[PDB]
Symmetry: C2
Subunit: 195 residues, 2 copies
């Protein structure tokens, strides 16, 4: 039968982008103010730094643009184990669908290398790099961004919001769904989209 196709974005779902940004920002700019994760709001971290103090958006971006930022990101709790199990389920195809952002120098390569490091070479085959997820056909999309953007007004996938510091204060209105973490019942969400 037809496989359930699930898209999972790496950022803030598999790899701890927010923790990495905060940790490296503080080490490189120890005499500047920063944004504790609990105070993060909205997916655009650099823009919030810019509101904190003029110039900090640029410094935060320079952190994310630095060599090894993406590669040295820590996996989120239970992320690698859940996605490995998910991909091993019958009638389930998992693709990692994630953005190069506007940082083409190191980000694409390190994202490939990160996935290979934690998931193996085989899994590299399942990666789709795109700014626009709406042109990718699938049954489900799990990512940390509450807003959909891209060329297709109504995507084929149901969008499921993975909890992150910047989105956790949003109280989603049904039937919009939230996955609180990888300890949460993700199998139930997948099963709901099966025949």
């Amino acid at each position: 039968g037809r496989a359930l196709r699930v898209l999972v974005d790496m950022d803030g779902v598999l790899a701890d982008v927010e923790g990495g940004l905060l940790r490296k920002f503080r080490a490189r700019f120890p005499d500047q103010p920063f944004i504790a994760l609990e105070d993060r709001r909205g997916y655009k971290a650099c823009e919030q730094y810019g509101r904190l103090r003029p110039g900090l958006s640029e410094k935060a971006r320079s952190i994310a643009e630095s060599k090894n930022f993406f590669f040295e990101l820590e996996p989120l709790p239970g992320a690698v184990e859940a996605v490995k199990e998910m991909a091993s389920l019958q009638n389930t195809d998992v693709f990692i669908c994630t953005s190069p952002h506007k940082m083409f120098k190191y980000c694409p390569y390190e994202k490939y290398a990160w996935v290979e490091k934690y998931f193996g070479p085989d899994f590299l085959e399942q990666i789709v790099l795109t700014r626009d997820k709406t042109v990718v056909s699938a049954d489900l999309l799990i990512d940390d961004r509450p807003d959909i953007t891209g060329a297709e007004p109504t995507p084929s996938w149901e969008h499921v919001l993975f909890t992150a510091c910047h989105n956790q204060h949003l109280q989603l209105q049904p039937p919009r769904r939230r996955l609180h973490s990888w300890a949460d019942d993700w199998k139930a969400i997948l099963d709901s989209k099966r025949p």
Copy 2:
């Protein structure tokens, strides 16, 4: 109204991969035999080099894996001008949909940089990097590979074959279509998929 969505793969359609491989192979390995473009058959160039002489698949691959291989590729005749015009047509969205191959170090980055060089920064937004084009939804796909591969058995796009040295000897059976070059009537092909 709904925009016509056209996927165009860079390799052998916008950027002259075959000419670049041959030119750099010959300069780096001047005392080895090579495959003239007229003798190329099948999209897998390294495999054909391997059949020519044991070890040459590895050398050909080392050419494509080298820094600046992708970035220094020459645009194919009329390619940049056609795609710029195509993207400027009303009710037409163009995405560049292309593979990282298994060469993650320089290939993704240089493909982004190549597109920016010839098409501008804006156009980077329209790039989709994937091994599997069948999970990308669209009306048309133009690439140089005669065979479809990927998870979706029947893709949403019509596949149009762009002529390249390795595929030109294939006589396509209707209704399969071929675009002979960018001087050919590509507008007619697009128009045929419009309402």
